[PDB]
Design a protein around this motif. Structure first.
Motif, PDB file in Angstrom:
ATOM      1  N   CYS A 124      39.404  40.404  14.759  1.00 22.94           N
ATOM      2  CA  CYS A 124      39.307  40.215  13.322  1.00 22.94           C
ATOM      3  C   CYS A 124      40.465  39.363  12.823  1.00 22.94           C
ATOM      4  CB  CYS A 124      39.326  41.562  12.609  1.00 22.94           C
ATOM      5  SG  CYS A 124      38.050  41.725  11.324  1.00 22.94           S
TER       6      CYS A 124
ATOM      7  N   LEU B 264      40.291  35.651  13.299  1.00 24.96           N
ATOM      8  CA  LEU B 264      39.466  35.062  12.259  1.00 24.96           C
ATOM      9  C   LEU B 264      40.189  35.074  10.947  1.00 24.96           C
ATOM     10  CD1 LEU B 264      35.875  36.061  13.122  1.00 24.96           C
ATOM     11  CD2 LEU B 264      37.600  34.602  14.243  1.00 24.96           C
ATOM     12  N   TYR B 265      40.829  36.186  10.706  1.00 24.29           N
ATOM     13  CA  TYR B 265      41.668  36.363   9.564  1.00 24.29           C
ATOM     14  C   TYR B 265      42.722  35.309   9.556  1.00 24.29           C
ATOM     15  CZ  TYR B 265      45.223  38.706   6.752  1.00 24.29           C
ATOM     16  OH  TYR B 265      46.185  39.024   5.821  1.00 24.29           O
TER      17      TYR B 265
ATOM     18  N   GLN C  46      43.263  32.723  10.927  1.00 24.17           N
ATOM     19  CA  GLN C  46      42.692  31.421  10.705  1.00 24.17           C
ATOM     20  C   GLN C  46      42.726  31.087   9.192  1.00 24.17           C
ATOM     21  OE1 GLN C  46      40.337  28.649   9.937  1.00 24.17           O
ATOM     22  NE2 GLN C  46      42.346  28.489  10.920  1.00 24.17           N
ATOM     23  N   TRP C  47      42.216  32.011   8.428  1.00 27.26           N
ATOM     24  CA  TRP C  47      42.357  32.052   6.953  1.00 27.26           C
ATOM     25  C   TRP C  47      43.832  31.950   6.561  1.00 27.26           C
ATOM     26  CZ3 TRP C  47      44.268  36.157   3.737  1.00 27.26           C
ATOM     27  CH2 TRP C  47      43.989  36.024   2.369  1.00 27.26           C
TER      28      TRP C  47
ATOM     29  N   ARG D 114      39.645  30.500  -0.088  1.00 25.47           N
ATOM     30  CA  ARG D 114      38.858  31.592   0.454  1.00 25.47           C
ATOM     31  C   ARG D 114      39.652  32.882   0.362  1.00 25.47           C
ATOM     32  NH1 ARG D 114      37.133  28.268   5.886  1.00 25.47           N
ATOM     33  NH2 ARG D 114      38.843  26.732   5.926  1.00 25.47           N
TER      34      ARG D 114
ATOM     35  N   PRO E 258      40.247  36.610   2.622  1.00 24.32           N
ATOM     36  CA  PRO E 258      40.413  36.897   4.043  1.00 24.32           C
ATOM     37  C   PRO E 258      39.175  37.512   4.679  1.00 24.32           C
ATOM     38  CG  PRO E 258      41.507  38.555   2.746  1.00 24.32           C
ATOM     39  CD  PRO E 258      41.036  37.516   1.782  1.00 24.32           C
ATOM     40  N   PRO E 259      38.847  37.045   5.894  1.00 17.22           N
ATOM     41  CA  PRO E 259      37.626  37.430   6.609  1.00 17.22           C
ATOM     42  C   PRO E 259      37.728  38.831   7.173  1.00 17.22           C
ATOM     43  CG  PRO E 259      38.937  35.995   7.989  1.00 17.22           C
ATOM     44  CD  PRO E 259      39.665  36.102   6.675  1.00 17.22           C
ATOM     45  N   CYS E 260      38.924  39.361   7.074  1.00 21.01           N
ATOM     46  CA  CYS E 260      39.231  40.708   7.510  1.00 21.01           C
ATOM     47  C   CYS E 260      40.314  41.311   6.628  1.00 21.01           C
ATOM     48  CB  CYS E 260      39.671  40.705   8.974  1.00 21.01           C
ATOM     49  SG  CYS E 260      38.389  40.122  10.131  1.00 21.01           S
TER      50      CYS E 260
END
Length: 25
Positions: free
Chosen positions: A4, A7-8, A10-11, A21, A23-25
Motif C-alpha cells: 500500500c 502506491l501511497y 508514489q503519491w 490527489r 493518498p491511495p492508502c
C-alpha cells in the motif's frame, strides 16, 4: 517491504497532499 505504501508514497513523491490527489492508502 510495502504494498500500500509503495502506491501511497508514489503519491507522497508526487506531492502528497500537494499533488492534487489524495493518498491511495
Amino acid at each position: 517491504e510495502e504494498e500500500c505504501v509503495r502506491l501511497y508514497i508514489q503519491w507522497l513523491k508526487d506531492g502528497g497532499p500537494s499533488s492534487g490527489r489524495p493518498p491511495p492508502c
